[PDB]
From TrEMBL, chains A, B:
6-phosphogluconate dehydrogenase NADP-binding domain sequence ranges: 5-153
NADPH-dependent reductive aminase-like C-terminal domain location: 160-286
UniProt name for this protein: 3-hydroxyisobutyrate dehydrogenase
Keywords: Nucleotide-binding, Oxidoreductase, Signal
Keyword Phosphoprotein among record annotations: no
Binding site for NADP(+): L10, G11, A12, M13, N32, R33, T34, L66, L67, Q74, N93
A GO-annotated cellular component: chromatin
One Gene Ontology MF term: DNA binding
Transmembrane segments: none
Signal in keyword set: yes
Record PANTHER family: CYTOKINE-LIKE NUCLEAR FACTOR N-PAC (PTHR43580:SF2), OXIDOREDUCTASE GLYR1-RELATED (PTHR43580)
Amino acid sequence: ARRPVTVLGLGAMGRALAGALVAAGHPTTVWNRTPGRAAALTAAGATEAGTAAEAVAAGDLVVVCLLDDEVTRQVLALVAPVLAGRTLVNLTNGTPEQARRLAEWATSHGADHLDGGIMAVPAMIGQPGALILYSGPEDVFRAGRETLAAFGAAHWLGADPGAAALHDLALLAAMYGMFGGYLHAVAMIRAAGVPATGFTPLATDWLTAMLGALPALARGVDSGDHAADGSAVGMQAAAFGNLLAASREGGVSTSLLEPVRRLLDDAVRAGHGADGLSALVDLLRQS
Amino acid sequence: ARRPVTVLGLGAMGRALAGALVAAGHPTTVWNRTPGRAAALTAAGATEAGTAAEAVAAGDLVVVCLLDDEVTRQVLALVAPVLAGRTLVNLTNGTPEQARRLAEWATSHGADHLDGGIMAVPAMIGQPGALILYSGPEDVFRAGRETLAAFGAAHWLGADPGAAALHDLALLAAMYGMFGGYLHAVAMIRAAGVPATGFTPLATDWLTAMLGALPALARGVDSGDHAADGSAVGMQAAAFGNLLAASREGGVSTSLLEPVRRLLDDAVRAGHGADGLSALVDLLRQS
Ligand SMILES: NC(=O)C1=CN([C@@H]2O[C@H](COP(=O)(O)OP(=O)(O)OC[C@H]3O[C@@H](n4cnc5c(N)ncnc54)[C@H](OP(=O)(O)O)[C@@H]3O)[C@@H](O)[C@H]2O)C=CC1
Ligand SMILES: NC(=O)C1=CN([C@@H]2O[C@H](COP(=O)(O)OP(=O)(O)OC[C@H]3O[C@@H](n4cnc5c(N)ncnc54)[C@H](OP(=O)(O)O)[C@@H]3O)[C@@H](O)[C@H]2O)C=CC1
């Protein structure tokens, strides 16, 4: 039932993942490059190993949560002789192409492969609300899905090994988008002596409602029909000029706004002024 | 539902506003540069004037809903001889500094002034929940509220005539940040084949959760303590690179992402790495 797992990487997230597996009843074998990181985990039942090969030999599922991909692929080489017959689960973050290169390496050593992107902070691992995106052979995922649940939620995005990274990084770009907009709003609000707490209620409500617009932008993106609904790219543009002028007269930098300006203006010059926001997506694809 | 109102401007939004006032019983007089947009309006009890001045002299509250502040100010200078004793409500979009100039102009000709941001589409006007932001002298608003409710939700946001524009545009900045990050994410997801209509559920849930960090960030902006929330500007600027890299791998521009990258790097160079995102706000201040 609770299958034996290996955790390679005893950093902040490594120790939260390993703890989560012990707290779930999985016999957890850990390993770190530097010693001294497993005292509370070993006192919970975890076994610390001295060799990375030793560790990986003690699990049918090898969770890897190292620093970058550079570290990861080095370490996994040292274990390459014993890797065959286990599933790799790289919860280390990276690019989608890196995930796709490691999938080849793994499959050339007779190891299955799953990539993951943790949408959670170490402090939430094991507890509700944690999300870890996963990508890889659907086969491999179904088998590990329950093991992986010890971390939180397991959401599979497809057999593209880079699918976890891609949704991880895209969800970051969205997050940074909203926050970027919000901090500029706050900067404008603060420039005029207006307290920030107090505006955020109104912001959340506004943004919550705006989120209901996305299913229609989704449609037009996938459809091709970039038809408007009451505010076409050309109108939205004129509105952005006031936003740039309000920021320039209150003493706030337009730096976060200037890309959005150019993408709107470029859709006007492209022929989408009477179209909807969905037509701005392939405008970001220079390929 | 009984103060006499004048609508200068019979575009799409203009015709909404006036029909909402007629639908409330308000005695309403309408004017548009181009004649022939009054049919339904007059048939509902309204009255169309020929000169803006005639129209302004038949109403106490003068709702202005024209094309830009230039058009507005041109039109209002025509009616300045007859603007004394009246209350201007400029529902035409604009900047904070523009409202404050219109205020002083009206006081100088004997008129009261509220500025207005319509956070609604013309079809929502009159319907409950259509949001319009007003700012100006407070007792002017309190006397107008029952008229202003014809259009829907009237909110007063300060004696500063510039306040409604500052809140309209600041919520616009916020909404364009989120759309920006959604569009950049969809670009990325679409470059790999992922249909966006299936991605939108995961985006909405993800961004809805990320809205929870705002009330913390706001306290930081207001307090001065940009204490980390765990994730720090210095680590939020170490996965901005995998995002940048994945964006390139999929043929997607980094245009909407370079300003956040730079701001995050500026904060590190300012000693705010261990601080949280709330520090970025006072770095958005034009030096
Ligand atoms: N921390 C977080 O909140 C989040 C992190 N992640 C991702 O998780 C991964 C790990 O982050 P985190 O746990 O905080 O990392 P840490 O900074 O805590 O440490 C990284 C891990 O890599 C090990 N390591 C570093 N260099 C080497 C090396 N040359 N050879 C072998 N092992 C090495 C470290 O052991 P040593 O003691 O020897 O350095 C440590 O176990 C990253 O890819 C990160 O993006 C996921 C989401 C958020
Ligand atoms: N529509 C919307 O969804 C939103 C609109 N608003 C605000 O409402 C305003 C009106 O929008 P909407 O009704 O859709 O715009 P329209 O383009 O439908 O109408 C614009 C108005 O401006 C008038 N106008 C244009 N040029 C002149 C001029 N030189 N002299 C006099 N009048 C002139 C037009 O009169 P004419 O018929 O003769 O051209 C018309 O009444 C916007 O500019 C904005 O400030 C608020 C938020 C969103």
